[PDB]
């Protein structure tokens, strides 16, 4: 899409409708005449365009109105309402831009943001842009959170997020023009090498891949058309539905063999009965012929009854001889059918040990995408966010994806090595208690109007709590936290002195020997300028490789690679790093997934702010004081960087409306 329509699409907005959000800020317009809505819709789409065409400079309301043109540059307050709505909710003037109008020396309100992750940084940068006082509390010695980047010398490799999932409607597309990010395309050609190290032949590779995709689509059929979504009062997982679908296909193979063979016995039996007719006819013809001979032996001249007996037996013999001839003709047809029916017998297996092993690699792929064993994903909902996928190829960041957080974090008050330990929110404001990670004795107290929490879902899940809420979070929020899933996947980064792989392939697989170890180093990435090869640990393997020493883990990598390129072309690696995210106390996992028994509605529960009760009883109900952002709070874009960033922009808009006031609703 191009034009002003492209601006709406590139802002994840319908170009010809008003969203639920705009209905709320402009209820006059949505309930008004259609002509005015087109005017609004145009003014919105146009303003978005102006921002997108140059996102390195602030888009003032004046510059916006000047480059509008009649009748659209007529109602100046409608334009001022549109620009103000878009600025507030981070659809324009978000990210890193040059401020035309410098921010006011006098701030307003105080916000403490927990976590300098992308969600935290995005909100912070926005609030500061709105004239508030923001301070971020960070437990680590760096920003970024799950956006980690190994750097030593020229070696660069992301242990965290490393892929930009298409730029078609991606807010990262704006950050990419605002930050010098080296975006590189990813070639989808992934060759699978089996346990021995021999490339899987292409024909087998395509039918397993085809079958895998068929199996998936099958589960969706079980879910939606057959309502196979509860089993024994427990919710069905994707893994269970795959097992049930594979079983029902292995059963069909067996059914179709029985039906085939059991149709050989159908004919072999009517063959048997044909022979018994023919072996008796042959004995009746053996006996009549003998009688005819004896009647023929009485030499003529004979009385007519003896002439009758010859001509009669001769009749009867040719009669039965014509009968037997037909049965042999009929017997050949049955013999042909048996020759054919045996010739085309249906396949004896649905899948075999070699076939299934390659299927396991496609399941590890899924387990990688969702950072969790397929046994935990909700069957109904695991794919609830696929309608909002972006367009374009998937990218990787050549210079290290940390360049984004580090960039956002400038101009911001970040306290590093500051671990929040308690969060107190009252009707009159909030205090956050943190400590120094380097020495736990130093204690800090931060007072503020509002806390924005971007604590990873796995931190929120921790029992006993790493962070105490005073008063404790209500049962609806805690329950959503338990129901939701926080998965795990780890990376092993391998640094060599020389490229020994195919440089024209970005990624190649390894097929595990067992179902259990299907995730164990199942996939490798060649993404960077330096000779660095990245190897994934996913599925049930992820949480188990975290109890094994790095040297053993690197060993297993070397073994894999030797099997591929020979014990000669694989040197010892210069530099080795291995992720252990579930162990990492500021993550306690990798990213969120729709657990079985959860749904995408829990993601919206996560994002509801908390409103403390009144201090004096009988006092009017207060403002909400505790807000949440991060990857687990955005229903339509979870478990991604762009989704974190979007959630930051969201709360910052929400908090500002609550504290600075929304003057764009009138």
């Amino acid at each position: 899409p191009s034009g002003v329509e492209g601006a709406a699409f590139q802002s994840r907005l319908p170009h010809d409708r008003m969203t639920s959000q705009e209905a709320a800020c402009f209820p006059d317009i949505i309930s008004g005449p259609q002509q005015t809505q087109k005017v609004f819709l145009f003014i919105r789409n146009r303003t978005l365009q102006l921002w997108l065409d140059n996102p390195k400079i602030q888009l003032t309301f004046e510059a916006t109105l000047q480059q509008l043109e009649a009748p659209y540059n007529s109602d100046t307050v409608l334009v001022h309402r549109v620009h103000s709505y878009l600025e507030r909710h981070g659809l324009i003037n978000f990210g890193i831009y040059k401020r035309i109008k410098p921010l006011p020396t006098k701030k307003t309100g105080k916000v403490i943001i927990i976590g300098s992750g992308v969600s935290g940084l995005a909100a912070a940068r926005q609030l500061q842009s709105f004239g508030m006082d923001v301070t971020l509390l960070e437990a680590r010695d760096r920003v970024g959170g799950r956006v980690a980047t190994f750097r030593k010398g020229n070696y660069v490799a992301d242990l965290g997020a490393m892929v930009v999932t298409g730029l078609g409607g991606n807010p990262m597309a704006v950050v990419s023009k605002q930050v010098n990010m080296e975006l590189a395309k990813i070639k989808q050609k992934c060759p699978l090498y089996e346990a021995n190290g021999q490339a899987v032949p292409k024909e087998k590779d395509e039918m397993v891949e085809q079958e895998f995709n068929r199996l998936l689509e099958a589960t969706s059929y079980l879910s939606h058309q057959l309502d196979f979504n509860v089993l024994n009062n427990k919710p069905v997982s994707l893994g269970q539905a795959l097992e049930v679908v594979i079983q029902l296909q292995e059963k069909h193979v067996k059914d179709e063999q029985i039906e085939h063979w059991k149709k050989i016995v159908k004919t072999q039996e009517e063959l048997k009965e044909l022979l018994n007719k023919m072996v008796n006819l042959k004995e009746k013809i053996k006996e009549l012929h003998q009688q005819y001979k004896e009647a023929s032996e009485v030499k003529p001249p004979r009385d007519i009854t003896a002439e009758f007996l010859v001509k009669s037996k001769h009749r009867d013999l040719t009669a039965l001889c014509k009968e037997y001839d037909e049965l042999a003709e009929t017997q050949g047809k049955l013999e042909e059918k048996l020759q054919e029916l045996e010739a085309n017998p249906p396949s004896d297996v649905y899948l075999s040990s070699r076939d299934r092993q390659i299927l396991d690699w496609h399941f590890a792929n899924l387990e990688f995408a969702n950072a969790t064993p397929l046994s935990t994903l909700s069957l109904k909902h695991w794919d609830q966010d696929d309608d909002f996928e972006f367009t374009g190829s998937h990218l990787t960041v050549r210079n290290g994806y940390s360049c984004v957080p580090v960039a956002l974090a400038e101009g911001l008050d970040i306290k590093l090595n500051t671990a929040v330990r308690q969060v107190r929110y009252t009707a009159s404001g909030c205090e956050v208690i943190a400590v120094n990670t380097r020495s736990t004795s130093q204690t800090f107290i931060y007072k503020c109007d509002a806390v924005l929490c971007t604590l990873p879902l796995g931190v929120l899940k921790q029992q006993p709590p790493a962070v105490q809420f005073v008063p404790p979070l209500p049962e609806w929020k805690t329950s959503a936290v338990q129901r939701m899933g926080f998965g795990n996947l780890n990376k092993v980064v391998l640094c060599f002195d020389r490229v020994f792989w195919d440089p024209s392939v970005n990624l190649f697989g390894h097929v595990g020997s067992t179902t259990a170890s299907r995730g164990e180093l199942f996939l490798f990435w060649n993404l960077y300028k330096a000779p660095i090869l990245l190897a994934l640990v996913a599925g049930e393997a992820a949480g188990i490789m975290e109890n094994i020493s790095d040297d053993v883990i690197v060993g297993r990598c070397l073994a894999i690679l030797k099997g591929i390129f020979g014990s000669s072309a694989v040197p010892q690696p210069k530099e080795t790093v291995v992720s252990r995210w579930r162990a990492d106390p500021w993550a306690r996992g990798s990213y969120s997934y729709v657990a079985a028994g959860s749904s995408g509605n829990d993601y919206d529960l996560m994002a509801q702010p908390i409103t403390p009760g009144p201090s004096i009883p009988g006092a009017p109900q207060p403002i909400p004081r505790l807000f949440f952002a991060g990857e687990h709070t955005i229903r339509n874009y979870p478990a991604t960087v762009h989704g974190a960033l979007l959630s930051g922009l969201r709360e910052a808009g929400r908090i500002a409306d609550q504290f600075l006031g929304a003057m764009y609703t009138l």
Binding site: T165, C190, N365, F368, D383, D385
Partner: peptide, 4 residues
């Protein structure tokens, strides 16, 4: 998302 299956991510290929």
């Amino acid at each position: 998302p299956r991510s290929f």
